[PDB]
Design a protein around this ligand. Structure first.
Ligand SMILES: NC(=O)C1=CN([C@@H]2O[C@H](COP(=O)(O)OP(=O)(O)OC[C@H]3O[C@@H](n4cnc5c(N)ncnc54)[C@H](OP(=O)(O)O)[C@@H]3O)[C@@H](O)[C@H]2O)C=CC1
Ligand SMILES: Nc1nc(=O)c2c([nH]1)NCC(CNc1ccc(C(=O)N[C@@H](CCC(=O)O)C(=O)O)cc1)=N2
Length: 157
């Protein structure tokens, strides 16, 4: 099973200077819930940004670098590799992999961050004419989660 997992803002920003522009503990909790016990596939820059494998799931990194051999991580070197991974596979970023995979995934789990941040990396444009809203759930605001956000589960029409 092949899903996108992403948070993007109102203008589809996903990154700035190899980090997330927002802090939203809840959405990382959201990622944890969705991905724990399964597989994350991510590009090299994204891994480097995370810097360590994410506990309690398969972390797969797509890189051209044949020297890449990290501890806790399985490496792949082409997109085709993804299609041989077993189980529920979340495409986890970044811009490059999203652009490569958006037309290939069954569904997307998108957190819409309801703000406008400065960014240098972007989720590709997509139309609700192509995607059907299996669910939409407003995230809860509180002292530690202060930007409004919506969890979308979208399914290709
Ligand atoms: N908001 C969100 O949901 C998330 C945000 N992000 C953000 O996105 C940004 C990173 O995105 P981006 O800069 O595009 O980088 P990526 O995370 O997509 O990593 C880019 C690298 O991935 C490798 N790669 C990608 N495609 C291939 C391929 N087809 N074959 C072999 N290797 C490949 C390459 O590594 P190499 O050069 O070693 O070959 C490439 O340079 C960061 O700011 C990060 O914070 C990332 C994920 C999620
Ligand atoms: N929807 C979504 N939101 C994101 O913030 C996100 C995304 N998708 N895809 C990839 C990605 C890459 N960045 C990061 C950064 C930190 C963690 C992380 O530490 N997650 C922990 C939970 C931490 C917590 O409980 O606060 C984990 O166990 O997954 C994950 C991804 N970030």
């Amino acid at each position: 099973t092949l899903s996108i997992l992403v948070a993007h803002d109102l203008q589809r920003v996903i990154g700035f200077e190899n980090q997330l522009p927002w802090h939203l503990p809840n959405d990382l909790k959201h990622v944890k819930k969705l991905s724990t016990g399964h597989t994350l596939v991510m590009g090299r820059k994204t891994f480097e940004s995370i810097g360590k494998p994410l506990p309690n799931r398969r972390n797969v990194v797509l890189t051209s670098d044949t020297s890449f051999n990290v501890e806790g991580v399985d490496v792949i070197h082409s997109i085709e590799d993804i299609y041989q991974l077993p189980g529920h596979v979340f495409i986890f970023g970044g811009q490059t992999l999203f652009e490569e995979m958006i037309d290939k995934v069954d569904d997307m789990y998108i957190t819409v961050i309801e703000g406008k941040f400065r960014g240098d990396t972007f989720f590709p444009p997509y139309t609700f004419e192509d995607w059907e809203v299996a669910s939409s759930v407003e995230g809860k605001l509180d002292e530690k989660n202060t930007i409004p956000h919506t969890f979308l589960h979208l399914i290709r029409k």
